[PDB]
Write a protein that binds this DNA or RNA. Structure first.
Length: 241
RNA sequence: AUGGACCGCCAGUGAUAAGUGGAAUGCCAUGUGGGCUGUCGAGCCCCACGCACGUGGGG
């Protein structure tokens, strides 16, 4: 069982621990987000039991860490006072203060290839191919790369993360081999953060911590693609086989 | 349906005024393009004539 999910695209955000106007992303995908991505693909209404998703495992290798950028993002500004965001008391604030100013962060030009291994993950892959709601990378405005699922069915996909999945253009030294790539596994634990989603109900979303261990591993330098456009070519060669 | 869903950074604005690149200056001195030379028998068809050697008409 298992399939390869490729998270790529111009921008993707995987925030955790932010609860005000400023938003912040983890430099790598968060299990909560990917689980919600599958739940959205399967029609799981907000508030439905998320234990079906329990028992999955997410090893994620970071091809390009990507640049982290902060996207300004106002809400309601430049509108007449009557048509701005409501207050909790119900009376709209004065128009010179009715604007909301959020500073949301997002990863741009970053690409990870998570190898999801679970009990029903093959039905989940078959659900991403025909989604109930549009899958997106973190914020809904970010739209996933068309090669969202590199392979629908793979026996031992981590074995395919160690090798035989192409890689972006990187420095390849003379007489070099085995270019270093950071794999992320789920003592030797990088960080602890609230990921595993106890409930997605918008009224009270709650989570619990998951330790992450990031192990730099060594994959053959043959894997990295040539400088220009070759990455797309090798990747497409990869999807048909 | 993902610390997410819904979500504008935005309303305004001459870069202006002034200005010779200017004065002087031979690319000069030398060189065969030469020897040779009369312009004097397939061709595909139709038709007419023929002394079946050959003539002519048309395409």
């Amino acid at each position: 069982s298992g399939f390869l999910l490729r998270l790529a695209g111009p921008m993707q955000s995987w925030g955790e621990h932010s609860m005000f106007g400023e938003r912040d992303t983890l430099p790598y995908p968060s299990r909560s987000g990917l689980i919600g991505m599958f739940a959205a693909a399967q029609g799981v209404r907000r508030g439905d039991p998320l234990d079906r998703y329990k028992e999955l495992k997410f090893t994620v290798r970071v091809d390009r860490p990507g640049v982290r950028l902060v996207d300004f993002h106002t809400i309601g500004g430049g509108l007449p006072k009557e048509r701005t965001v409501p207050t909790a008391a119900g009376e709209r604030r004065d128009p010179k203060k009715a604007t909301i100013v959020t500073s949301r962060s997002y990863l741009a030009d970053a690409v990870f290839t998570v190898a999801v291994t679970g009990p029903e993950a093959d039905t989940i892959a078959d659900a991403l191919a025909a989604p109930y709601w549009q899958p997106y990378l973190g914020r809904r405005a970010f739209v996933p790369d068309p090669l969202l699922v590199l392979r629908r069915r793979v026996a031992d996909p981590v074995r395919e993360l160690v090798e035989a999945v192409p890689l972006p253009h990187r420095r390849v030294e003379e007489d070099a081999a085995t270019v270093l790539v950071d794999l992320i596994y789920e003592t030797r634990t990088l960080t602890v953060l609230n990921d595993v989603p106890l409930s997605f109900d918008s009224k009270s979303r709650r989570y619990s911590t998951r330790q992450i261990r990031v192990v730099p591993t060594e994959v053959p330098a043959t894997l990295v693609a040539g400088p220009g456009r070759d990455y797309q070519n090798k990747l497409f060669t990869y999807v048909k086989q």
